[model samples]
Target chain A: PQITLWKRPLVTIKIGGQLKEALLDTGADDTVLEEMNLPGRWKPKMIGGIGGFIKVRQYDQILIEICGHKAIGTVLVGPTPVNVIGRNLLTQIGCTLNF
Target chain B: PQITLWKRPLVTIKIGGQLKEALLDTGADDTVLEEMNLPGRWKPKMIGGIGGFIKVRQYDQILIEICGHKAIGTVLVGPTPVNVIGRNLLTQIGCTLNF
Candidate 1:
């Protein structure tokens, strides 16, 4: 499927059986999302971006569905202003920077 | 050309006769670059992202080359932690979010 790039490319995703919209951030190394409750054990991690570093809970082997494509990857839950889908999941969906 | 997504999708881009690496940020509305001198008339503006808002000088009719594709669009100069190629330029280069 082809998706157009908007001012901000946002896509619907299902993570842990929860639906949410996330920004398709190719610049991000890892996916970061707004803090949510999950029934699993996660390791504490810190991620840095445009502004600064943020504390997050890194969950491994999480199932994420983007645009109907299912992918198992790491999802970082934290106090992010926006939910981001990074290359970790983008690769699983065969995303490419094409011209 | 088909480009693979990496942990961080950094691509070489030529802007204002200078070569630099920029992240292909689908999450951003406008292209933002680290502070550099460019010859043009620009308006002062602020753009917000996952972190917060930042002041920038918006320049129009700028030429940018990504992966050998030339695109003329708006480029913002400011104190950006990293150079980002956003939807403004990505659209011109026919970038798509695909699976």
Candidate 2:
């Protein structure tokens, strides 16, 4: 499906059998989800932006389904306002930008 | 042109007779530029994401050339780490997401 940029490129995603809304973020390098519990070990990490940074839990080898397409990559769990599917996962799902 | 997500979708943008690199961010609703001075009226604004928010100056009807495509929209000037071309301008350039 072709998605226009008139609005935020948010889509349905499923992780660990739970459904959620996530943003397709071409600006981010790592995928990050809102605070949640996952049955695995995670490393303490930090991600920064224009203003400041936030500490998060980094979980590797996680599986996520974006728009029903399967993707496996590192997922960071943090105090984010929204779930962001970044370039790492976007590449796995073969997402592209066109004009 | 088609841009794969294997790397950052950065493109050359020209604004005010200046050239800069900007990310084509589908997740953002408004375009944001790093701290810069523009010749126009601006209003104080705030934009937030993931962890925190920051104050910015909103300048409407700003002309930007993204990948040689001309677009005019609201652009926010602030302390952003990098310039982001968001949906407001992306739509004007006919940018879309495909797989």
Best by lDDT: 2
- The CAPRI classification for model 2 reads as high
Work out the TM-score per prediction: 0.91, 0.97
Q: For residues B1-99, write the lDDT of model 1, one tens digit per residue.
A: 776786577889998899999988888878999999898799999887566677889999999898788999999998788999989999998898777
Give residue A57's error in model 1 in angstroms: 1.8
Please report, as a residue range, the 10-residue window in candidate 1 chain B with the lowest summed lDDT.
B46-55
Q: Which stretches of candidate 1 lie over 4 Å from their true place?
A: none
TM-score of chain B of 2: 0.97
B1-99 in candidate 2: lDDT tens per residue? Answer: 999988889899998778989999998889999888898899999999755898899999888999889998899999888899999999999999987
DockQ of each: 0.66, 0.81
- Winner by TM-score: 2
Listed per candidate, the RMSD to the true structure in angstroms reads 1.7, 0.9
CA lDDT of each prediction against the hidden true structure? 0.86, 0.90
